[PDB]
């Protein structure tokens, strides 16, 4: 009685959590992609500020 019900509730909770995180992850990622394009389109400016933004975008750690 207990065990299966407890796990089913946990699954439901984790499913809602994953859905919210997925949407947030995609929302933020979308912004980064839009920003990456803006930087790319203006590479001809030789702007040090965009270089900083570019380096942030491509950083691994």
Where along the sequence are the contacts to a copy of itself (CB under 8 A)? 3-4, 7-8, 10-11, 14-15, 17-18, 21-22, 24-25, 28-29, 31-32, 34-35, 38, 42, 45, 47, 49-50, 52-53, 56-57, 59
Q: Shortest gap between Cβ of 38 and a copy of itself (angstroms)?
A: 6
Q: Shortest gap between Cβ of 10 and a copy of itself (angstroms)?
A: 5
| C-alpha distances out from residue 36 to 7, 22, 24, 52, 57, Å | 42, 21, 18, 12, 7
Alpha helices in 1-61 (DSSP H): 2-41, 48-57
């Amino acid at each position: 009685d207990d065990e299966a019900a407890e796990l089913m509730q946990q699954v439901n909770v984790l499913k809602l959590t994953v859905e919210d995180l997925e949407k947030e992850r995609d929302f933020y990622f979308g912004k980064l992609r839009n920003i990456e394009l803006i930087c790319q389109e203006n590479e001809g400016e030789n702007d040090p500020v965009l270089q900083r933004i570019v380096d942030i975008l491509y950083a691994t750690d």
